[PDB]
Amino acid sequence: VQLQESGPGLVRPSETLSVTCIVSGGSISNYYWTWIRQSPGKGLEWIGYISDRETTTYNPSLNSRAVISRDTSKNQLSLQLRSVTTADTAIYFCATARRGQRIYGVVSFGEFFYYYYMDVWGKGTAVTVSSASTKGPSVFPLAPSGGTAALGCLVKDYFPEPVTVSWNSGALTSGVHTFPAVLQSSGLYSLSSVVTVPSSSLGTQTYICNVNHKPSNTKVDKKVEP
Amino acid sequence: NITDGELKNCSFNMTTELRDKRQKVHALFYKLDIVPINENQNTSYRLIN
Amino acid sequence: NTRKSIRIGPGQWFYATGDIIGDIRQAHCNVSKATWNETLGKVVKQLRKHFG
Amino acid sequence: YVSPLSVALGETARISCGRQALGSRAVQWYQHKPGQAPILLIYNNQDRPSGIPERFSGTPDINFGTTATLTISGVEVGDEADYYCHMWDSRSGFSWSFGGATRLTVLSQPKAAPSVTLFPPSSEELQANKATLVCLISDFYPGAVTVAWKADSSPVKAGVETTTPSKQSNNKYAASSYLSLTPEQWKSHKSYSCQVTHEGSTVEKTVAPT
Numbered sequence: 457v458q459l460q461e462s463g464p465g466l467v468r469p470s471e472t473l474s475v476t477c478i479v480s481g482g483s484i485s486n487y488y489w490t491w492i493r494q495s496p497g498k499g500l501e502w503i504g505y506i507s508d509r510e511t512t513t514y515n516p517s518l519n520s521r522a523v524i525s526r527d528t529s530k531n532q533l534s535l536q537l538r539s540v541t542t543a544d545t546a547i548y549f550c551a552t553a554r555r556g557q558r559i560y561g562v563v564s565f566g567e568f569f570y571y572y573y574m575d576v577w578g579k580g581t582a583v584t585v586s587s588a589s590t591k592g593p594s595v596f597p598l599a600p601s602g603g604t605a606a607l608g609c610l611v612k613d614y615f616p617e618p619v620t621v622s623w624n625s626g627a628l629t630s631g632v633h634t635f636p637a638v639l640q641s642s643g644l645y646s647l648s649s650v651v652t653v654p655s656s657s658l659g660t661q662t663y664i665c666n667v668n669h670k671p672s673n674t675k676v677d678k679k680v681e682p
Numbered sequence: 683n684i685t686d687g688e689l690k691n692c693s694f695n696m697t698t699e700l701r702d703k704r705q706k707v708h709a710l711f712y713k714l715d716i717v718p719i720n721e722n723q724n725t726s727y728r729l730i731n
Numbered sequence: 732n733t734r735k736s737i738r739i740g741p742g743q744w745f746y747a748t749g750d751i752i753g754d755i756r757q758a759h760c761n762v763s764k765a766t767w768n769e770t771l772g773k774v775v776k777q778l779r780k781h782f783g
Numbered sequence: 784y785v786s787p788l789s790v791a792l793g794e795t796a797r798i799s800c801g802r803q804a805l806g807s808r809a810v811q812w813y814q815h816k817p818g819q820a821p822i823l824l825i826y827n828n829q830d831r832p833s834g835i836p837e838r839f840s841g842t843p844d845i846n847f848g849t850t851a852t853l854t855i856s857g858v859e860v861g862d863e864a865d866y867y868c869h870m871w872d873s874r875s876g877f878s879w880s881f882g883g884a885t886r887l888t889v890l891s892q893p894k895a896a897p898s899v900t901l902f903p904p905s906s907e908e909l910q911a912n913k914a915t916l917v918c919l920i921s922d923f924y925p926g927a928v929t930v931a932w933k934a935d936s937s938p939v940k941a942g943v944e945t946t947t948p949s950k951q952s953n954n955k956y957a958a959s960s961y962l963s964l965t966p967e968q969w970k971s972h973k974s975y976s977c978q979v980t981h982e983g984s985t986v987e988k989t990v991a992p993t
């Protein structure tokens with residue numbers, strides 16, 4: 457089945473967090489749903505899971521700060537981590553949990569135990585916890601010999617991560633390379649995405665870089681020309 | 683670490699090869715061979731006999 | 732089970748129970764229900780010879 | 784939480800679980816690539832779901848005194864990732880921790896030459912009273928790369944922002960260098976140069992105000 461997360465991106469500390477997970481490929485009242493996160497410099501931290509009877513079970517290491525609920529009217533999974541600090545900056549994943557029964561003896565004697573394994577995952581959503589407000593990048597066209605030339609867009613000064621860069625929707629797929637962002641000393645991110653374009657195609661074909669800074673949110677269209 | 687046992691873990695002070703020296707050792711016992719000492723109740727026990 | 736020998740006196744060795752290796756499983760006994768029901772029936776035939 | 788594991792190109796690699804089961808166990812294995820979603824490799828000690836190639840294997844629980852071990856045989860550059868061991872035994876209870884991660888590193892990869900591309904500050908950036916030089920390095924291995932900037936013939940020390948090396952979709956590292964300047968400092972010098980150093984080799988490109 458398919459899972460996809462949506463999040464506000466960046467919120468000020470000591471308030472309320474709310475993310476959502478839209479399920480696709482199966483029934484939501486049909487499975488055990490769980491949430492996993494991963495902070496920079498830390499491993500995967502299990503948050504909790506909800507049953508098919510809408511009964512929840514959270515990780516005690518979160519100090520009861522998490523609440524999971526189901527919404528069959530929209531087939532969406534929700535997770536609220538409530539009042540968090542800078543240490544909760546992580547990538548939250550929603551996943552499907554299958555419950556297996558490990559039997560090592562007589563069932564009547566309770567000589568068995570349950571285990572949960574996650575087989576279907578989502579791509580995750582980037583969440584940052586800062587005291588500043590978001591900032592939109594002012595991108596600039598990088599104007600363009602071996603038969604090909606370099607063609608990119610300079611996404612400069614934004615906060616926070618990430619930024620999805622596409623070129624001509626589905627037309628430009630290769631070779632399109634979006635380089636990772638850089639954390640400036642001012643607390644602003646910046647990346648660059650170049651495309652290998654032949655020299656003969658310049659002046660005849662048109663190229664645009666679709667910048668998606670969803671956490672801001674921003675959109676700057678730039679028709680790059682030599 | 684089971685939530686919701688027929689045997690308890692009981693630690694105690696025991697005499698050694700020497701008289702003045704006393705040791706603290708751990709040993710597993712069954713619940714049927716041990717009754718509480720206070721029934722008030724704490725978690726202190728003794729042997730049934 | 733494991734045997735945890737702890738000396739409690741000159742030559743006196745008290746053998747206590749150490750940590751159980753593996754799973755905790757209470758003891759039990761299996762009796763064939765087909766055989767027990769059969770045998771129990773053969774008993775009540777002789778019990779009726781003394782109780783009607 | 785990171786367990787370093789040095790292996791070569793496709794040798795026999797044994798990933799031992801950090802925790803040892805106290806009784807009958809049910810081990811899960813996860814493959815996590817930085818920036819991607821976790822992938823279920825092995826569930827229930829040895830079973831694997833469909834889509835997992837016959838490379839990942841687990842150790843079964845036949846009551847023997849055998850430690851849980853992730854058996855990956857013949858690693859490629861696409862198996863270079865982190866691995867968690869989810870341990871479930873009858874004695875530890877409900878295990879919420881995935882434990883430490885075993886970060887796999889694949890060596891013996893053919894040496895690749897970095898492809899450098901340098902861009903001058905855009906015209907819309909100059910009118911905004913800003914100026915930045917973007918130096919893009921990619922398609923190189925290993926990740927050890929030293930990037931340096933030079934104005935005319937003197938090395939620039941301040942204003943240089945460089946990213947950390949990181950592999951991409953082609954299993955090769957890529958980096959970026961940003962030298963922020965002012966419109967009066969960009970037009971002051973006749974030329975600037977981004978000089979990178981990879982495996983002792985020194986390549987360099989050059990831009991100039993025009």
Ligand SMILES: *[C@@H]1O[C@H](CO)[C@@H](O[C@@H]2O[C@H](CO)[C@@H](O[C@@H]3O[C@H](CO[C@H]4O[C@H](CO[C@H]5O[C@H](CO)[C@@H](O)[C@H](O)[C@@H]5O)[C@@H](O)[C@H](O[C@H]5O[C@H](CO)[C@@H](O)[C@H](O)[C@@H]5O)[C@@H]4O)[C@@H](O)[C@H](O)[C@@H]3O)[C@H](O)[C@H]2NC(C)=O)[C@H](O)[C@H]1NC(C)=O
Nearest residue numbers: 556557558559560561562563564567758759760761762827
């Ligand atoms: C007195 O009698 C007691 C009662 O009969 C008896 O207690 C029994 O003891 C045995 C041995 O310890 C236990 O068997 C144990 O079973 C576990 C689990 O493995 C079992 O798996 C399937 C069920 O799971 C299936 O479904 C799930 C989804 O729900 C799937 O994910 C999973 O993959 C399976 O498809 C079960 O059908 C198996 O049985 C088949 O397979 C085996 C192996 O080929 C055959 O030998 C068997 O005849 C049958 O064809 C399998 O049992 C296992 O992991 C352990 O290793 C162990 O084998 C019993 O659970 C337990 N209770 C009962 C009611 O049987 C006492 O042992 C006996 N003696 C004493 C002294 O008390």
Ligand SMILES: *[C@@H]1O[C@H](CO)[C@@H](O)[C@H](O)[C@H]1NC(C)=O
Nearest residue numbers: 683684685686687688690713
């Ligand atoms: C410890 O054992 C006692 C003995 O019956 C039991 O009543 C109690 O519930 C156990 N502790 C916990 C936390 O369950």
Ligand SMILES: *[C@@H]1O[C@H](CO)[C@@H](O)[C@H](O)[C@H]1NC(C)=O
Nearest residue numbers: 692693694695696704705706
């Ligand atoms: C052992 O002796 C010490 C010191 O008197 C005491 O604190 C402890 O409670 C004793 N333990 C038992 C099990 O009696």
Ligand SMILES: *[C@@H]1O[C@H](CO)[C@@H](O)[C@H](O)[C@H]1NC(C)=O
Nearest residue numbers: 760761762763764765766767
């Ligand atoms: C007891 O064990 C023997 C082993 O040979 C087996 O043949 C027999 O069926 C068992 N009986 C029961 C009641 O488990």
Ligand SMILES: *[C@@H]1O[C@H](CO)[C@@H](O)[C@H](O)[C@H]1NC(C)=O
Nearest residue numbers: 764765766767768769771772
């Ligand atoms: C015992 O045997 C009788 C005779 O076949 C049968 O009717 C009855 O159901 C059996 N009871 C059990 C417990 O097997």
